[PDB]
Structures are given as structure tokens and as C-alpha cells.
Amino acid sequence: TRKAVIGYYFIPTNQINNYTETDTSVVPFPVSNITPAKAKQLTHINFSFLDINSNLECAWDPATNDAKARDVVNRLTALKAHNPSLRIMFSIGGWYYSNDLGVSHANYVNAVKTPASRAKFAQSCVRIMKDYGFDGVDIDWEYPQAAEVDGFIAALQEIRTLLNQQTITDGRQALPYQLTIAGAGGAFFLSRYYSKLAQIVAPLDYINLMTYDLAGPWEKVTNHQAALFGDAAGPTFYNALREANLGWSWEELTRAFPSPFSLTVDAAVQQHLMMEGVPSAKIVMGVPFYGRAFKGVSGGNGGQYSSHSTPGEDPYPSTDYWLVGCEECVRDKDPRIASYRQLEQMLQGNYGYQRLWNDKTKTPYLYHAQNGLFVTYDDAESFKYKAKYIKQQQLGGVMFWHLGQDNRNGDLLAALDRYFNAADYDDSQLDMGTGLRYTGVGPGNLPIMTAPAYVPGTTYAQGALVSYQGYVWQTKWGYITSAPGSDSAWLKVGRVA
Amino acid sequence: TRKAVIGYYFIPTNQINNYTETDTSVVPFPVSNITPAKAKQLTHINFSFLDINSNLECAWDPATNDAKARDVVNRLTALKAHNPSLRIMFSIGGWYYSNDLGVSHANYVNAVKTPASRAKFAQSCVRIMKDYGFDGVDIDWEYPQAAEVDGFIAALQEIRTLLNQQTITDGRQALPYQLTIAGAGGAFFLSRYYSKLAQIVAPLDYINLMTYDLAGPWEKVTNHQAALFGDAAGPTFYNALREANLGWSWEELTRAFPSPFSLTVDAAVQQHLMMEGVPSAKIVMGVPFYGRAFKGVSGGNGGQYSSHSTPGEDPYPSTDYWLVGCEECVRDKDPRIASYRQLEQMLQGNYGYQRLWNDKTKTPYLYHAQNGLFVTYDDAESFKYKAKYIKQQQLGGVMFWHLGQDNRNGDLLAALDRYFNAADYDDSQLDMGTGLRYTGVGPGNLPIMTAPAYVPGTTYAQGALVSYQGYVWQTKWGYITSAPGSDSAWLKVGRV
């Protein structure tokens, strides 16, 4: 099956209202930059962002000129002429609108509350989808938690029912309407809804993991924002999943959630796979088309894992733009983030950056010895390891944020497409390295094991293994006279064939 | 409130059937040995043991001669003439009958299975109580498993309903009929029903913890069987409670159940107090009136924490009665258990025993350097610290096994009564020592704390403290944007 390549097309309301394809100072990345070749390299474009209004229906930001919005969307759907597999999805939410303290958070919580609110909301998603010409619905609520998860699940199930009916009504069986969500790529936010992942993923075609932003100014030590595997030399973190409402024993929690652990892309993917009923084919690995920069770093390890003096507030509080050579940073007023396009230009501008590589995390980084800067980002090389991982782990594909940050030739997107589909690319001998793998095992994804059947009336010593009612169990202490499952003394450690 | 002093009176079926008070060779400890003065020092005598039969009803051993049984019970209830607060309870169960591999185990599991089986069983308990003249029901099932706990809880609730009705019908408002159980005194067995402790204790007047037998021949290294506090030099154990079906988070389990830990009396008591809904006044501390003996021990620590060669099987799988000086051990064909009465005689008989004292565990022990023997037991001295703990921790009182093991003068019982009630006994300066205390924190023993009220809309850093809905909470990581109870980033760490 072809791997998904899902690219976000993000355009702020002011750019839609003043949309033009001949002035990059107004619209830096118009749709015309997406050529037929690039359209063929994508399977999905996630147009972003729509929101949920106070009437609890999907809607465009009220400040949007509707004609101009339809025109931008039309330019995207016109790309379908070049690729009969391409879908132009629309994404509802995003951090700004849906985070706990975001402008529209309450609308997300309230829209998923009751059967009636969920029906009205779901109907509105399909109406916007058909009215504007989109091919599916993507929901990026960052992130539901607690008492909101059951409502969220039921809302997704309702949208799925409505989309499936629309597919039949429209005779779209050859390119059925789809439903996806953007999911957390790190344990802290993932812990909000982790316990119910199987129900969340059931109605979806894909769950697109935001497996980036795993390092940033909000952290004390500089680190790679999207390390594939872990570097024992780098910082480690508290495994928040150990605190999710799972109903697992201390041993089960400890085995599933090693802590501290390396916050990496492999950790997020493996954490999803540890849950019963979450298929690998629905998991999509997100990658960043931008880098994160830090100032005030020490030398020694190329700026890696160093203390730094980078402001964490949002927006960037100062007027000081210290990422040398990054003029895009001046335009956007923040020296802490730079598009791959810009970072590549900085490497061709003889500005004093060294492009370095960490062979454990399989990611590149920039180090500016003279000014003490460190930049963590991804490129065509790190994507070879990530694409190989997607293939080996049988994942659904790749998602990225965002199209406008690729260079002018679309090299990062071309690389991803190449690694999945080019007959002349051969990664059979690509060495995945010895970086740290996530080794948790969940009571939901135990290995096949074999042991003698439990014999009632027998007393077992500590460490004894038996098979009983579909699983292999091990005793945690001695003189065990109880049957497995029926008490605290036994630990499920494997599944019976 | 007077502390309970609950002493078991155990008499095997063959002794009831041949009951006599003038021949210690037949009945070593007849009811007449419980003089008026001893009767006044007890608040309860637990007559033991009755059982649950295949008919799923409370009942005596079938081999029991009922007329002799009634007569022994009448002698015990006659003691009430000497103490208006005394209750003669009867105990159903015990290890022999009710353990997982015991002869009557299935009857316990089956009796609590359904509303009908529970009603029939509860009724039989009250019928037996009234027919023989007992003052309450004590159940010693060792021990219901997770799946049987709901039925067990329901059975206790049904017995409580019937007993409360009987108290009113019999005009016993001044001395109500009571319901108690012997509960596990170690984490391993306690983990079977720990998660529902509040429900188990609700219908009871007391839960009598079997806070002894915490060391035995079944263990690799010798140890004190009822250390009050821990000795870092001694063995430590896996904290089975962290595996109970509590539904708690990793941090919550970890802070409540440190592992490994010291298996002590304090650990069991604190583990009970960690549960919300378990009142200290219902917890009764059990103490042994006997010691446990080990052979094959080596020197360096007076026999403590040593490997040994004592058979752990029951019955005693040999005929070698190696506990020098212990005559009762020959009578009972087991050298691994010796009553305090017998130990006291062994100490004054020049048999090679040295009495030593561990000041961390606050318990005595015997060491026999010549033959390599070790004996862990309790005495009037160890009871000073346990009595002070009972008072300080506001526990309900003490329980002990068994009356026939005290010496002829009843000194152990007199000591317990003195420590609780004597106007001229003053333990204000008794130093409780530096032994290890159990430090777990749970929902039932959160410390009082103060913190700023949680404010909706505020973002909190890691380690921040706030008060919300009556408790003080702390963040486990940073950038916390939702409320305690609705965001798993918060840990309840204090109350008020």
C-alpha cells in the first residue's frame, strides 16, 4: 500500500483576504508554488485552519472574506487534476484555536457534549466539506482530556457515519471521504487521552502524530526536537503515561513506561503500538519542515545538551533577532524558528554555521561556534531513516508542517516521495544505528510465550510461569496458592498461542 | 474509651469431648484457669474454632460432642459475672479450615456467593450465637481473594444487620452484639482485599490484625516474627500492596508502598490507616503469646538474620524435637513453636539460652550458641512499646493468640491490662527507639497543608502547590493548564 504523504498548507486569514500569487511579501507561499510534480508527490494536503464557533459548528474565522477563501481552496482542489489519489482535507483546530487557553477552546469542549451537539457539529463538518469542495475532515484539537474524551470519541464516530453516507450519496467509492486527527507526539500531552487510544483511532483513516517540538525554549537543556532514537548523552524526561487512568498495576506501569526516558519519535510511535487495537497502518509520523534555534549555548558537544539563554514566552518578547542570516526570522519577528528553506540558505551564505550530524538520533543540527547558537532541524538525510522506520514498522506514512517551509524546489517533499516510491532509491543497507529504542511492553501488546498450564491446588514459587485463560503469567512473590488473574500475585507477561 | 483486650481461647475437639479441669494431661488449659482477676483484664474472649460446613452454614466440628461443647461455653460465659464488659465471642475459620488449601475452603467461597447463600449463612451465625450464648461473631477466613471480596463484604453487612436487630430485641444496648474479623497482618495476604478495606471494616466493631507470624521456617533467613519497627540489618520484602487493584497512578502507588520494606507491626497498622474510611479506633493490634524457633542458625548476630535448617512443612515432617528444654514441644510434636509459658521456664532452667533484645524492633529473642537455635517471641517488655503505640496511634486495642500460652500467673495479660489501665503506670518517657517506621502516604493519611486556591486560567510550573476542592495538590511536570482532578498532572499531597 502506498504510504501517505500528508502536507499542511497553512494560510492566515489576512493572507487569504489579500491573497495574491505575485507578491511574496503579502503571501510568501501561494498555491501556485505547488506544481504538478509536487501535487503528485503528496497524497493529502491539510488546508489549515478552520475552527468551531460559539454556535458549536465548524466554521471559518468570521474575519475571512468568503469569496477569497473559496478561491484559495479552489486552487488547491484544482491540483487533483494532476493526481487522482490526492485529497484536499481541511483541518479544524490547531494550537492557537484549541489549546486549553486558546480563543475557541470552550467551543470544542461544548460541541462534543451531547448526542444533539455532536450531531449538529458533525453535520456542520460535512456541510463545510461539501460547500467548499474538500475531500475529508481533519480535527486538530490540542488536546481533549478527562471528561471530554468520551464526547470527542462519539463526535468522531458521528462524523465517520456521516462521511460514509456522503461517500455513497456522491458515488465517491473510488476516493472515499476521510477522517483524520493530529495527535500528540510526546507523552505529556498524550497522557490526556492515551487510555482511550483504540476508541479514538477506530473511526479514523489516520492519526497524524506531532512527533516534533520535542525540544524548545521552554526546556532547560538544548536537544533535538525530533530525534528518531535516543542519545544516552541527551536529557531524559518523566514518563507521563505512568499517570494516565489505565488501571494497571505498579509492575505493569513500570514495564510499559520506563522513566526517565528519551523523548523521541520512536518513543511516541511505540507508545501508540503498546495499546491494544491501535493498528500500525493508521499511525502517521509527523516531521517538521522547520528548525528550532537556541542562543547562549556552550561549546564542547556542538551546542547539544547545553544550557542556553533563549526566551520562552510567546510571542517573542524582544526585538533582538540573533539567528544570523535568518531574514525570514526578521519578517516573522522570531529568531527561535526558521524554515528549512531559510536554514538551507543560511548554509549557502557563508555565515559561520557548521552542519553537524548525531548518528544516534539520526538528525542534523547547526552549530555556530562564534555566536553560540544551536539549531535542531530535519533534512533529506534524517528523512531517510524516518522513511525506513515508517516502512519497517508498517506505519501509514508521513505528515509534515508545513509546505511553505520546504525550499523552492520542494526538495524535502521530493525526498519523502523518493524514499517511499522511487525504483532507483535503495535503502536496504541503510544502518539504523544504535541509538536508544523505546522498550516498554503493554499488557495490551504482550509477546507470544509458552508455559505449563496452571494446576489448581498447586503452590508456586516466586518467578514461576504458567499459562491460564489465554495468557502466560508470572508470580511476583512466593507460596502462591491463588489462580492467575484472581489476585495481585500474578503478572500477565505473554499471550498463549 | 477503654482499649479492647481480646484473647483467644482455643480448644480442640478431642479436648472438648474429654473436658476436665483437674487433669492438665487431658485439657492443658481449662476454663477454670481464667480466674476472676484474668476475666477482669479481658474485654473479649474469642472461643475458637467453629467452621462453615458443606451446607454453607456456620457450625461446630461434626465430631464435637454438643453437650460437652455447651458446657465449656457456659463456663466461659459464667465469667461475665466477674466483669460486666466481658464478651465471649466465637470465631469461625482459622488457618486450618479456611486457607486456600484447607479442608473447608470451598465452603467459605460458596457461602458468600449469592444473596441467598449469604442470607442463610448470616442467619446461621446469629442462630449459633443465640443458641450457645455467645456475645458476638468473629470470622477468621484466611483469606478471601479479590473475586470473593464483594461477596464477603455483603455477608458481613448481612450479619451486621441481623446482629443490630438482635441487640434491640434482646435489650443489649449496654453491651451490643459485635462483629469482628481477624485480618492479615502482612502485605502479601492483605493485598487480596486491601482495595476494599473501607467496605470490609464498615460493618465491624474491630478488625483484629494478625500482626505476628511475620517470620517463620518458610522464610530463608531468621527474623523477628512481630517486630514493632524495622531493623535495616534485617531482611526486607516485596511490597505486595503496590499490585492491589487500586486503580492508582504510578506516583500514588510508589509513595504509598515503598518496596522493598520491613515487614513489621507498624507497617501493617500504617497500611490500614493509609486507606480512606478505615478508622484507627477499629484497628486492633494482634500480638503472639508464643515464640517461633529455628535450628541450624549461625553466629555473629545472636541467631538473627541467619540461614537455618528448620522444616517449614505442616505437620512437622520429623520426630526430632530439637528445641532443648521445651517439654510442651514434645507433647505437641513440633519444636518450632513454644508458648511464652514454656520459654520462660526454658530461660530459668539453664539450658544454654541467652535472652537478647533488639532495640530497633523492640522485641526479645533467644539465642542458643551451643546448638545453633534462635527464638523470636514477645514478652512484657515488648508489650510496653506495643501498648504505647496502640495509645499513641489511637488504635482500638490488642488481640492475642492464645490464653493457654500465658504463664500460670497470667503475666502477659496482666501487663497489657496494666499498660492501658493502671493509674500508677507511666510510659510518658518510654523511648520508642529509632527503628524504621513505615512512611507510605495514601488517601487516608494525607497531612494537613495550606496552599493558594487553584485559579482557573492560570498556568502552573512543575512543583506548584494549590488548594482545590478541599485538598492540596502538587504538579508532577510543567505548563499545567487544567484543574486538579481533571488533569492527571496533579498529585493530591495534603488535606484541608
Ligand SMILES: NC(=[NH2+])NCCC[C@@H]1NC(=O)[C@H]2CCCN2C1=O
Ligand atoms: N505558535 C504555535 N505553537 N502554533 C502555530 C503552529 C501550528 C501548530 N504546529 C503544527 O505542527 C501543526 C500540526 C497539526 C496542528 N498544528 C499546530 O497547531
Ligand SMILES: NC(=[NH2+])NCCC[C@@H]1NC(=O)[C@H]2CCCN2C1=O
Ligand atoms: N491448632 C493450633 N493450636 N494452632 C492453630 C493456629 C491458629 C492460627 N493462629 C492465630 O494466631 C489465630 C488468630 C486468628 C486466626 N488464627 C489462626 O488461624
